[PDB]
Structures are given as C-alpha cells and as structure tokens.
Amino acid sequence: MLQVDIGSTSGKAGSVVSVPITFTNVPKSGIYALSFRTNFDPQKVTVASIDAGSLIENASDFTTYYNNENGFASMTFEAPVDRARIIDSDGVFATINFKVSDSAKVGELYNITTNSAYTSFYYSGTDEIKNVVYNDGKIEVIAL
Amino acid sequence: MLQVDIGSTSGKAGSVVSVPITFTNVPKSGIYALSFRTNFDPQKVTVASIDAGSLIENASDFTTYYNNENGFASMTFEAPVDRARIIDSDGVFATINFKVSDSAKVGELYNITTNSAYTSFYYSGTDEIKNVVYNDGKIEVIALEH
Amino acid sequence: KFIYGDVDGNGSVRSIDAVLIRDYVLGKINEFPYEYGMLAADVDGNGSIKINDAVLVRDYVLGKIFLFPVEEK
Amino acid sequence: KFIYGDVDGNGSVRSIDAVLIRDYVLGKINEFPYEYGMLAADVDGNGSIKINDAVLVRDYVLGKIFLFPVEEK
Ligand SMILES: [Ca+2]
Ligand SMILES: [Ca+2]
Ligand SMILES: [Ca+2]
Ligand SMILES: [Ca+2]
Fold first, then answer.
1. Given this structure, which CATH class describes domain A1-140?
2. For an engineered disulfide with D22, which of A61, B14, D7, D54 has Cβ 3.0 to 4.6 Å away?
3. How far apart are CA C69 and CA C73, in angstroms?
4. Pick the CATH number of D1-73 from 3.50.30.10, 1.10.1330.10, 2.30.40.10, 1.20.210.10
5. DSSP state of B31
6. In this structure, are residues A10 and A104 in contact, taking their beta carbons and an 8 Å threshold?
7. Sign of CA dihedral C10, C16, C20, C25
8. Where are the domains of chain A?
9. Residue C46 and residue B43: Cβ atoms within 8 Å?
10. Between the CA atoms of C37, A79, A60 and A22, what dihedral angle is there, to the nearest 10 degrees?
C-alpha cells in the first residue's frame, strides 16, 4: 500500500530541524490530489517554514499553510487537469523546518503526528486511495 | 518511557469495532492529568460510544467528547486533588467503539491517529511528562465475520 | 437553495470557489462565506469536504467535467 | 483587565471555570465567550491552553494553591 512517513530527527534546544514527509509505494498510475496535515505541541516546536520536496514538479500544484497557535501544518497537492504533472514515483513530498523551543531539555520527545481527519489521497477526482498507511515521526532533543 | 498504544482491529462494513487505548510503562509516581485525542476520517468511521477502561477507578475523574462531523474523539483524566485515584499502573485507559460506514469496501484501512496538539500527560499540575511515545492503530475492512 | 460548487454563494461556480475549498482543507478558514457553503462544497456528495471536492470544482471551471457527481454524474 | 482563572468573565474563579477549560481541551468549544477567556484560562502562562490549566484552576478553587504559576513574580 502507499506508505506516508513523517521522518524523525534530533536537534538542540533553540535549533531549526528538518522533518521530511516521504511517500513509498506510490501508485504508478499517479496521485492526482492529496492533503496532508501534521499536528505538534507548539510549546515544544513551531513551524519556521515548509519546503516542497522533489516530488513537486511545479509550484502551482502545491499549497501550504501552518498555524503555530493551533499546532498544525497542512499541505495540498493538485495535479493539473491533464495529468502532465502527477506524483507517480517515490520520494520526498515536503519537508517541515521546525524551530525547537529554547526551553527544550535533553531526552524530550516531541511527536509529529498525522491527522487522519484532514489527510486524504486520490487517484482521480472521484477515486480515493483508501488503503494508505500513515507512519509518524519524533524530534528528539539532544545536548549541546 | 510511557507508551500509549491505539489498538488495531478489523470488521465488516456496517459493523461496530472496538479500538482499545493502552498505556504501558506508566510512571509509578502517577499521572495526575492527561488529555488524549484521536482523529479519524468521519466518512469512514464514526464513534458509537467511548468506554472507560480498567485504569479509571471513578467516573468523576474521566470525561469524553467526540465530534463525528469533524473526525475526532477526546478523553481527559483529572485525578482528584488528594490523588485518591491516580493512574500509576499499566492497562486499558479507554476503548472507542467505532461504526464502520455501511459503504466501506473490503481492503480499506482507516488510520486512527494520536493528535499531538491535543494530547498531553502531567505528573502534577505543573510538571509535564515530556517523553511519551505513541503507536497509532488501523481498522481494516474485511469481508468475513471475526 | 444553492448551486453545487458555489461555495461563496455569489451565484456562479468560479475558480475562486475551488481556492476557498482548498483553504478550508488547509485550515486557513473554518467556514465558508455563505450560509450554504458547506453543502455547496461537497460536490462528490460523500458527506464531507475533502481535497477532491476542491479539484472537482477546479475541473468543472476548466471544462473537464460538466456536472458534479452529487448531481448524478 | 481580567482575573487569571476566570474563564467565563463573571468576576470570580469557580469550579465551572475549570470545566470550561476542559471543554476547550476536549474540543467541545473552540473559543471562550468572554473577551479575555483565552488569556484567563492560561494559568501556567505557557501560551497554550492544556489540560493542566484546567486542573490548576480546579486546584485553586479547592484551596490547594493560592495563586497561579503565571502570577508568581
Ligand atoms: Ca462562487
Ligand atoms: Ca466530498
Ligand atoms: Ca468565573
Ligand atoms: Ca497553559
């Protein structure tokens, strides 16, 4: 089945870390449209920026938004109507650059979670990918 | 460290399945307060009911809410001020009974996900448990009974 | 009464209606600027607003489809 | 002007205030009907409303603590 992974990583208190969102076993027929939402505790990390990954061929297809007060980041993909760009291979969809709190302590674990209510994947306008598996990730605080 | 597990299960279209929420490696000093929120796709499953598990010794301490239009279920535990009840051992915190849509097709997989923005665990009113792990669950739609 | 796809209620199904559905999925908005926007947004008729309702509205504005699945097609 | 803990804005920190903070954490509400309820609810002063804010308010009402962490100078 298509497998979505939020990468885990580590960093120091006060640092920016980079959390990749990966797609494996992407259908060769293509993903036409998707949304993906991650939650996090904004006392632990906040979003500095979100960067499209190499699976995005044209920026007009990809849209992001994040709300640090409410602890979420969202991304959408909409292939053009002729499917001239389509996600039909495996790789990095996007990366979220998170600022780790200045007050983080060594050994804390901040879970970066997939929100299944706001995440969905489609082969076409009417045909949903209904067996996608979400895998979440963790930011570990390490010592300077 | 404390580990929260959303169990996986399976059932037919139209059925009610149950998803247990288990806590492992609970601190012996006790969890005084927590919130736990799960999301789900509300056109795939909806919450029929939430049942407190054996870790809840008195209903006064446990509160639940779900919104079947928006796709979440939330649970809180607040120990009394004397810590007369406290969660300080491992077991089932709660079980969510989910109705699988009658239009579900066999082979669909529904991710029942821990929401880190709305989930937190405290040893006391000011001291947070800041290394908790979560392991989410899936509901698989099957064709046959059991 | 409402027109399917017309999420801002202005009487026409336009490219901005698809933008507004995508803004709702992204979390930029929590509601549509129209009494019947949530209903008008659900153009596949599955009962929820999802990213494919946005792409369906876009594809209808672009002339790829001529009616919405909720319209029986 | 507001009183820490007084999430319903009625001028007093009471049992129900902690219930209201719990309703927010549960998702039953998305905002407080008091102009200053969000700032009043954040009694640990960390910038987020979380379950321990609700238990702090309850514990103040019950007499376990006599001030909130946001007030400690
Ligand atoms: Ca319109
Ligand atoms: Ca829909
Ligand atoms: Ca009050
Ligand atoms: Ca707080």
1. mainly beta
2. D54
3. 4
4. 1.10.1330.10
5. B
6. no
7. positive
8. 1-140
9. yes
10. 100
Q: Resolution of this PDB entry, in A?
A: 1.5
Residue at token pair 């009494």: C35
Q: What is the CA radius of gyration of chain B?
A: 16
CA quadruple B111, B117, B118, B120: dihedral positive or negative?
A: positive
Domain range annotation of chain D: 1-73
Give me Rg for the CA atoms of chain C: 11
Q: Which method was it determined by? A: X-ray
CA quadruple A79, A82, A85, A87: dihedral positive or negative? Answer: positive
d(CA D40, CA D3): 6
The Cα–Cα gap between B125 and D52 comes to 5
CA of D34 to the centre of ligand 3 (A): 10
Is B76's CB within 8 Å of D44's CB? no
- The three state secondary structure string of A19-63 is EEEEEECCCCCCECEEEEEEECCCCCEEEEEEEECCCCCCHHHEE
Output the CA A41–ligand 3 centroid distance in Å: 27
Please state, in angstroms and rounded to a whole number, the distance separating the CA atoms of residues A99 and A109.
Answer: 14
